[PDB]
């Protein structure tokens, strides 16, 4: 399953600054084209990391599961304020902070 | 034209050798490679396969092992039969069907690849030639091993690395002051010993809590991947080898791990380590009558490893006598009796003092000076001795010659380096700024209740709680109470930041929780960008936060959370810091201020301490500034006075109402401070510090490196190299390139590369600000790796090109010939300082005239262009009879150019190797720490160098054919 | 790009159609809808039409550019640039000779 977490591979902390811990923009934040609208992570499988790389991953905290980002971004050239956010979970899904 | 039985080679993986057509279908052909027995099937179209036929003059070998000489080959029904003279039997007219050729037909010196069909590209030939030139020139650079490390260019560090990294089997004790970079100098010395080839196997023994730190420090700063050996790893390596320590060249392990079993320590002592490094060796207590069971395992190790580096500290204001226990491990025969060392240090102590008076600008009584005169056992001391003291014109140079001679007479300084924070320049000054804020009533009311209810509880815990009001306001105003709304410190912080938006500010607080609350409040009430740096985060995330903080003007304005620190590369661009709180003990206070107070900062430090009126903060500010002078000056008095005052001062913290006796405690603290400072400055072995910091020659080396570090040709060669190999280089823009492999990369795996990519920077300052990037230099493994990959492979060694020039005759022949002069010697000898693989370019004409001295490579290459695969293929064979005659033309001149190069190189070798051997002989006549093994090693190295150089050879590396057309 | 002229049109003979085609598509399946690798034989097939990704075989034994004509022994896909997957045609062997609707209606 893909994840909505705010931990998104190889994004600068600039992009996360406007995101809460759950990974959703704050209500009332002003965004611009290319800004990350919401955080999403694409899963990676059959990583087959080398044993020294696996040891490096444990100390560094690098996630084999991530390495790809499916995060939605504000469309190019549209800029406004986030006035409202809604979250719809199915059965067996934990409620996020925003929820 | 594939037909069963023909011999073909691969243009790229010729390491497979010859192949044989064994099947054919509509689209594909199959080659068997008898070298391995595998078959590879290729599509006929685009035909990346090579016809194997031979010409008159070639020598070939048959499957029965005999060889022969080909003169003519017939072809019938697609098959070749070679006709010629078998040389071992002298039989003429011998036939050999091509199916019976051996596989050991490797990519011969390119005069054979002319008839291989499609030839390689011309930009890979360009990369090949440029690569050999740059690698050759860089191997001989004087300061190799001193630019690729991810450190600031601090003179004393580079000096220590230069001195120690070039010794043979170095055995030294690093007793640098705490916080100066002991592990940094250690890593630099390791980088030198590994890069120079002097060492291949290394063992570092570290306490477990620091093992990961070493793993990251050596990996991120020095590009060295160490293998950590724990019990699990030890077992999995026991399975893979008789000796587990044979599977990896570089090994980290714990000293507690080292002592587990005896068979373990013996396997370790037999693993044939070239170097052993043990940090914090002062934890090894040793008595001559009773050595501890801990010291005994290292004493067993340091005898089985030639070079051994011990990193240690020298605390509690004691002398190097405490160090004897470890010096005994370096040279057990030279240092074998405590008392003699005691006599030496006591009788030199007055001499050291008198020297300190000399260089301090004092006069030295005759009674004093005839004790140094006793030390330097000569007779012409007097004339040079007096000019230095009378302040004549050359009193400076006479002082410098005296100190130079003094260092050679120091009893330990060749084997002991002690840099002090007083003997090293470059540190920024530190100015303090205090701000008195009114303690808000919400805190007074919340704490007085705990005060009343706190009837029976020790003052120690009253002061530990009352230190941080935020976390007692969470018991009476409820947990998570919004204290970040009335606390005046927050308003002061915001006001200062919003009034100084163009300044990066380092803000230190006690606990990570308060740091998260601070980020939230600065954001939701002033929009201040602040990254948190706490212990709970992973290494990559904290690195990400440092990255954000490093953005010149678009990133985080603020930072920071709890102690953690430990970030080797520092915030050299940040010069203003605010202490949102103050720590309890002075060691954490001075280390926190240390994180920034480093050599290489932008400007002086401004320290701002906003503290609440009438609380423990108000006490501690007064204690630290007026009493210890710990903010504006760095003298390490804090711990002693802190221990001598602890129990008294606690009462002054837990109850700031009792004011009498405080101001006298402060004067007592300042008195102790002055006494400790005086005793320490009068205990300074300023000679040892001058020998340690390297002086003016070391600062000159450091600035030569600071100027070599602006090499733009490096970046321009790098881009070409990678792009040719097929590595996508996305330019993020802020001096950071992101390298990612590509679908068209040229090698199965790149050793360092991963599909997710790596970020690099060529600027040392960006690297010091962005530890997530690889600091690329000529000595960086990525470049050395690609270099070995290209110069070992055969791509870029052969191509053809046409030239359209009206100012030349039609059909003229120019031949670019790149010979390579090489020596065969073990890398341990470090022959590459004097003769790396060296290119010899020659631009021959139809008459064998060399133009290379007149015709530079680039200018000639610019106006040249390549051909198409097919026409060019046999266009090469159009001059097969000519080029063969062109080669011998240069054959007679290459030996002249070679003998010039060899003679000059052997000359440079004998001068420097005799000058260093002479210096070492002078030292043995002047210093007792030089071992016989050392001098024997240098003599044998000189002899072996002259011998291996006397047998150096040449070889044809590259060959480009040029034919002028006007079509 | 060649310098050409005269575009010629005529009936395709079955041997010419066999000439253009690189392989037979035996089963109508295309992809596993679960793992998006193409079918071993199908309307999207790496061994017939070309490698999905530039210069790397399906099973992943050979991925480097050094190899440009090799055809992986496990997966019969040749290693070349994925652009070729744009030009390679396949063919189907019909059991019953079938009429061309254009030339009839
Ligand atoms: Zn495959």
Question: What does this 3D model show about the protein?
Answer:
The PDB classes it as transcription/dna/rna. Keywords: RNAP recycling, RapA, Post-Termination Complex, PTC, transcription, TRANSCRIPTION-DNA-RNA complex. The entry is titled "Escherichia coli RNA polymerase and RapA elongation complex". Chain A is DNA-directed RNA polymerase subunit beta. The organism of A is Escherichia coli (strain K12). This is part of a larger assembly, with chains A (99 residues), B (967 residues) and C (105 residues). Chain A is mainly α and 99 residues long. Chain A is 15% helix and 4% strand. Chain A has two helices and two strands. Chain A has a two-stranded antiparallel ribbon. The two termini of chain A are 19 Å apart. The relative contact order of chain A is 0.27. By secondary structure, chain B is an alpha/beta fold. Chain B has eight domains: 52 residues, SH3 type barrels; 60 residues, Roll (SH3 type barrels), CATH 2.30.30.930; 127 residues, no CATH class; 302 residues, Tandem AAA-ATPase domain (Rossmann fold, 3-Layer(aba) Sandwich), CATH 3.40.50.10810; 209 residues, 3-Layer(aba) Sandwich (Rossmann fold), CATH 3.40.50.300; 52 residues, Helix Hairpins (Helix non-globular), CATH 6.10.140; 78 residues, Dihydrodipicolinate Reductase, domain 2 (2-Layer Sandwich); 80 residues, Helix Hairpins. Chain B has 32 helices and 31 strands. In chain B, the strands form seven sheets. Chain B has a seven-stranded parallel sheet with strand order 12-13-11-14-15-10-16, sandwiched between helices. In chain B, 35% of the residues are buried. Chain C is mostly loops. In chain C, 10% of the residues lie in helices and 7% in strands. The interface between B and C is medium-sized, with 19 and 18 residues. The structure holds zinc ion (ZN). The site of zinc ion has 7 residues of chain C, from loops.
